[PDB]
Design a binder for these strands. Structure first.
Ligand SMILES: [Mg+2]
Ligand SMILES: [Mg+2]
Ligand SMILES: [Mg+2]
Ligand SMILES: [Mg+2]
Ligand SMILES: [Mg+2]
Ligand SMILES: [Mg+2]
Ligand SMILES: [Mg+2]
Ligand SMILES: [Mg+2]
Ligand SMILES: [Mg+2]
Ligand SMILES: [Mg+2]
Ligand SMILES: [Mg+2]
Ligand SMILES: [Mg+2]
Ligand SMILES: [Mg+2]
Ligand SMILES: [Mg+2]
Ligand SMILES: [Mg+2]
Ligand SMILES: [Mg+2]
Ligand SMILES: [Mg+2]
Ligand SMILES: [Mg+2]
Ligand SMILES: [Mg+2]
Ligand SMILES: [Mg+2]
Ligand SMILES: [Mg+2]
Ligand SMILES: [Mg+2]
Ligand SMILES: [Mg+2]
Ligand SMILES: [Mg+2]
Ligand SMILES: [Mg+2]
Ligand SMILES: [Mg+2]
Ligand SMILES: [Mg+2]
Ligand SMILES: [Mg+2]
Ligand SMILES: [Mg+2]
Ligand SMILES: [Mg+2]
Ligand SMILES: [Mg+2]
Ligand SMILES: [Mg+2]
Ligand SMILES: [Mg+2]
Ligand SMILES: [Zn+2]
Lengths: 110, 43, 53, 122
RNA sequence: AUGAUCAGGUAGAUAGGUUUGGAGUGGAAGUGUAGCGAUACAUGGAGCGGACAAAUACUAAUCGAUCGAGGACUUAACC
RNA sequence: GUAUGAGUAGCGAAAGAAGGGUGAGAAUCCCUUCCACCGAAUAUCUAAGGUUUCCUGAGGAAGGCUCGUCCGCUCAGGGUU
RNA sequence: CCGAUAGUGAACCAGUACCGUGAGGGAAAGGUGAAAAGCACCCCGGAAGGGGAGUGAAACAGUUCCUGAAACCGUGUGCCUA
RNA sequence: GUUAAGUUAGAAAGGGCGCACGGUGGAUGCCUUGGCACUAGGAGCCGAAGAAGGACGGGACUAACACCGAUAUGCUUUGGG
């Protein structure tokens, strides 16, 4: 009935990936791929690979019709954070968060 | 800006080296203290 | 210069109402049937106005 | 007219370089604003080449760059971009009154999202 | 500022080019003549001329797609 | 440990352009041409200080205020008479 | 008597890493499974990472791996709201 | 049917409350390799026949620990197994 794919600990901040994942939800898979291709953000290639992986393993493992799928749900979750520092004036240092994210997409019929 | 540390191999050896520590009773006292604490680097 | 009070979750979510982004202006190619932007060359066949580019 | 992010002399140098590039290669890829300026520049150059006399040639020589297009065996002698403009490109449009270039939109650049376009002399 | 506003998208003068102009500057290049030369004169209000004016479909406004009504009840006047 | 400020301040003096190549991927790596900057220096030696940063072949997790196919970064072999 | 913020500073290559010219100061960091049986093979992807298949009592035990609270970040929805 | 006067629904760009399912994070429980305080006994010094503490080396492969010293991951002998 359904298939899913996940990408774990991708080095991209969750907000910047959510802003793109929002406009793929509940769409036919071909339209969603086209939408991702023409959105000039840095999160589009990662989500495109996750979505195509989900379509591929739906086709292979469950023998579903790859021409009648829709994006059932897509979401972004927080992964572990890399802690860095930036030298500021007067001899002090400030914190930097290099955040990562887990990206999940699910596809199904109708 | 000229800062406080201006390195010199010879000056470092002559002020803080092993043979300078061994030449006074208080230097050998420093060496004994650092041996008692167990430090890997003496002088 | 400095925030007097911390911001609540509801206030932050209200301010983030308009920080979404739009949906691309695309349609299907008359030649190859693929999706493409209007007034742009088709990247899948190199067509524009029904001619090779 | 457009200031293209740079001072007067830098803008003039950029325009001269791009116009010579379009004359030599006849089809280049660049950003949209630069294309919309070299449109004007290159078409004025082509009109000067169509006029054909020595005054027009000396005026075009104050803007075109001194670059080699090719070497031709005739003692092998090189051909320069001014010679190509006056001898090859200008006679091509002897029966067309205006509009010697066209602009074709391509899409955003990966590094900075700039809108890239193709400009060719046709 | 960006949105917005207004003028248009081949039922086309919206922008650029082109052709004729205009302001502005002041007499182009090449050639010839005079002079030993610096230079002067002629061809000739010449040449050039962002943003200003009018003509002209040469170049780009191609081709698509999306949104958007079927009109609640009561009473009173007419009908 | 994790928020708010907030996708906000900043991204550390400066001229770049196009054409070829490589590659899963190129404003950022390689090559060509044109342009620009220093030039009692932003050139060449050499003390101190550092201690393998030097060369070659592979690599792209982290570091590099962006990207990276590149690197004073990672790995393996060398190199100083 | 303590049970990993406790008990030695140190249950782990600790007077180490790191800081300081120096004398000197001085950390953090335990737990797969009874047994590696540590996932042959197929599929998407450059890889990372997944979906199956297999091992096992358990993989929602998959080499920071027993349990897995709260802050904090999300997706869906019953009732309310310009 | 039109006109006039009056009444009442519904809505979500977003938000609130409840619930379900996840992520991050490391509390809690269980556990122990390491500690703390003592008791009985032993022993209370090593060095010019070179000490305490170190540096550099020794392996088929050897960065670190442990062991050993150019007889170097060890040699002789007496017992145990
Ligand atoms: Mg004394
Ligand atoms: Mg403009
Ligand atoms: Mg542009
Ligand atoms: Mg005049
Ligand atoms: Mg913070
Ligand atoms: Mg280039
Ligand atoms: Mg190194
Ligand atoms: Mg970095
Ligand atoms: Mg930065
Ligand atoms: Mg490569
Ligand atoms: Mg290297
Ligand atoms: Mg614990
Ligand atoms: Mg175990
Ligand atoms: Mg066990
Ligand atoms: Mg592949
Ligand atoms: Mg794999
Ligand atoms: Mg469990
Ligand atoms: Mg378990
Ligand atoms: Mg949990
Ligand atoms: Mg929780
Ligand atoms: Mg709700
Ligand atoms: Mg509602
Ligand atoms: Mg609405
Ligand atoms: Mg909504
Ligand atoms: Mg809520
Ligand atoms: Mg409420
Ligand atoms: Mg709530
Ligand atoms: Mg709740
Ligand atoms: Mg967890
Ligand atoms: Mg906690
Ligand atoms: Mg005792
Ligand atoms: Mg080794
Ligand atoms: Mg011997
Ligand atoms: Zn096409």
């Amino acid at each position: 009935t359904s298939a899913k794919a996940v990408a774990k600990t991708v080095r991209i901040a969750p907000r910047k990936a959510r802003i793109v994942i929002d406009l793929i939800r509940g769409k036919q898979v071909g339209e969603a791929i086209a939408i991702l291709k023409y959105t000039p953000r840095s999160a589009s290639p990662i989500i495109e690979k996750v979505l195509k992986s989900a379509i591929a393993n739906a086709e292979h493992n469950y023998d579903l019709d790859i021409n009648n799928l829709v994006v059932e749900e897509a979401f972004v979750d927080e992964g572990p954070t890399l802690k860095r520092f930036r030298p500021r004036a007067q001899g002090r240092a400030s914190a930097i968060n290099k955040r990562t994210s887990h990206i999940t997409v699910v596809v199904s019929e109708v | 800006m000229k800062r406080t540390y201006q390195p010199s191999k010879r000056k470092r050896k002559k002020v803080h080296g092993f043979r300078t520590r061994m030449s006074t009773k208080n230097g050998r006292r420093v060496l004994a203290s650092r041996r008692r604490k167990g430090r890997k680097v003496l002088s | 210069a400095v925030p007097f009070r911390r911001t609540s979750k509801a206030k932050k979510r209200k301010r983030r109402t308009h920080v979404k982004l739009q949906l691309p202006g695309m349609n299907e190619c008359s030649n190859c049937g693929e999706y493409r932007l209007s007034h742009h060359v088709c990247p899948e066949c190199g067509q524009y106005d029904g001619k090779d580019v | 007219y457009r200031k293209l992010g740079r001072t007067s002399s830098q803008r003039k140098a950029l325009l001269r370089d791009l116009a010579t590039d379009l004359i030599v290669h006849e089809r280049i890829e660049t950003t949209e604003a630069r294309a919309k300026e070299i449109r004007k520049v290159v078409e004025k150059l082509i009109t000067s080449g169509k006029k054909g006399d020595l005054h027009a040639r000396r005026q075009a020589a104050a803007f075109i760059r001194h670059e080699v297009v090719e070497v031709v065996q005739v003692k092998n002698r090189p051909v320069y971009a001014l010679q190509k403009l006056f001898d090859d490109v200008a006679p091509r449009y002897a029966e067309r009154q205006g509009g010697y270039t066209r602009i074709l939109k391509k899409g955003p650049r990966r590094g900075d999202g700039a809108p890239m376009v193709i400009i060719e002399l046709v």
